[PDB]
Design a protein around this ligand. Sequence first.
Ligand SMILES: N[C@@H](Cc1cc(I)c(Oc2cc(I)c(O)c(I)c2)c(I)c1)C(=O)O
Ligand SMILES: CCCCCCCCCCCCCC(=O)O
Ligand SMILES: CCCCCCCCCCCCCC(=O)O
Length: 582
Amino acid sequence: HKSEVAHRFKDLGEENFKALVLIAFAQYLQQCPFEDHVKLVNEVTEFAKTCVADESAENCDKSLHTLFGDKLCTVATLRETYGEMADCCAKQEPERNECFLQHKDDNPNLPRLVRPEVDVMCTAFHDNEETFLKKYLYEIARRHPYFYAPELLFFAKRYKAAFTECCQAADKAACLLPKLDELRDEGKASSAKQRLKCASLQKFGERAFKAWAVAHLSQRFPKAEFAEVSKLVTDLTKVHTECCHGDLLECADDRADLAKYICENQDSISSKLKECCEKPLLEKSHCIAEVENDEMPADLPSLAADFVESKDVCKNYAEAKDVFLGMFLYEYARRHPDYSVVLLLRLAKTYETTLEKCCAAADPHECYAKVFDEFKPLVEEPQNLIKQNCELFEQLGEYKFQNALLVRYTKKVPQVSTPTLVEVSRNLGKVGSKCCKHPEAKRMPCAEDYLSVVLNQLCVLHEKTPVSDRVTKCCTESLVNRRPCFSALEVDETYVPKEFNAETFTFHADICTLSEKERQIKKQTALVELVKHKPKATKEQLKAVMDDFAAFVEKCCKADDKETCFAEEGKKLVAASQAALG
Ligand SMILES: N[C@@H](Cc1cc(I)c(Oc2cc(I)c(O)c(I)c2)c(I)c1)C(=O)O
Ligand SMILES: CCCCCCCCCCCCCC(=O)O
Ligand SMILES: CCCCCCCCCCCCCC(=O)O
């Protein structure tokens, strides 16, 4: 009431408070050393406590934004280190704060953070647990200035948890490594999705975003009333706009409020929101965002009734087009938790194009009467791709399955870089093992989820170093045609093969002493290079060469003479393979 600091402190807790103030300052002062931030934190915490003791103590009446800027402008090397950002201190709130956001480098130049040795980490953890964790919290925060702090805190705790369960294990590494790898990928996925939603909100605008949300929200709260789903979509759109602007405090309050609204109207939204709503402030939002779908009414009518059979469908559509179409989505989405959001968007879009070119004819009721018949092929395209790809992934394993995609895409866009093809193919292979293990009912939503970051990752790279108009075409089409576009790419007939290169196909006995991750990437790299040299090769001709190669390695990484074997037998493979592939 009288003191925000005092208040946030009381219901956030000392520990969470100290850690968030740390992440907050590291995201602006990305250049100050660790021991400098630790001091700031302690000082702010000391302040907070003074206010808890007495709401009226000096300065406790001021706003968090104001206290934040005042403290930020206290750094004596501000102008010398950050330069232009110091000029912000000459302004007044909201301008000052507004000025600080602008001068926050989204991608600073800091060395990549390397992962030390399990023993080195575990001993550091043991000795001084807090500094070990806070120093890494600091290193991650300054590198990801836009990552929602509370979310970064949630990750820190999963990290602490892994060091507790693995450093006391007989085989530490066997325990820790696979956990760290999973956290990293999950951390990277969360980040990509975060900056992806803000990008879309910018390019395509509110309407398309609201569309996306309606479908999404009604798949999870199928029992909610449309007016409820609209209310939430409105607020959810306000929250994302605010959070994307980058203002941590504003973003936080809007999320708290929305989490508050939801729990209070719980029975009217979903039955699966119990746990989430009994959780502490800091977690409510996060929990709710990951909540599972409630179950649908089962006593639901049929779409064709109100959207195809009704005679005054155009009368309702002309009165308020977006609301009606919004109704369509809501109706269609909550009967299909198994459709990907884009699929539902693709349907609404198609329904829209019909109402437009039908409500402007003599007899409307017979112009659009066959709409649902046009949904069939849209629905089946994504499904058939799943079964066809998940089947193939069963035959081969994650590794061989990746080799197939590799051959398939290299032929699609040979122009693309070998290391990029390998990376994309490896991720697509993962998505296959992460989503095919689910029952048909959850596959499509899963694939949509993983394919969106992977395809946006792809487009970004091609954004920097464009190499194909086709990839750029698919990359600049709507977020609803993005995937169908890539799925429609065909073999590159125009492509002219690369000239042979002995070097590129010469293997020394180093691959013998390499890890699984190294051997594969080394084989997969050669494979792509193989396709780029002879693009007209058959799956047969190819499978044959890979066959000679498989053994070839074994026969040199199991012989009394490493290098010699690899150079003698290697000369024989290259020559024999060249003649095979003509
Ligand atoms: N290319 C990296 C590995 C990597 C593979 C995938 I596939 C991926 O994408 C997702 C998407 C979602 I959605 C998840 O929940 C998760 I976990 C990972 C990411 I980011 C990274 C490397 O080898 O360096
Ligand atoms: C609550 C009102 C929002 C509903 C708006 C319905 C829009 C349906 C069209 C599908 C959106 C795809 C985006 C686009 O192509 O513009
Ligand atoms: C011009 C012919 C050069 C021959 C080079 C052969 C390179 C093919 C490597 C493919 C690796 C197969 C992968 C595997 O066996 O698991």
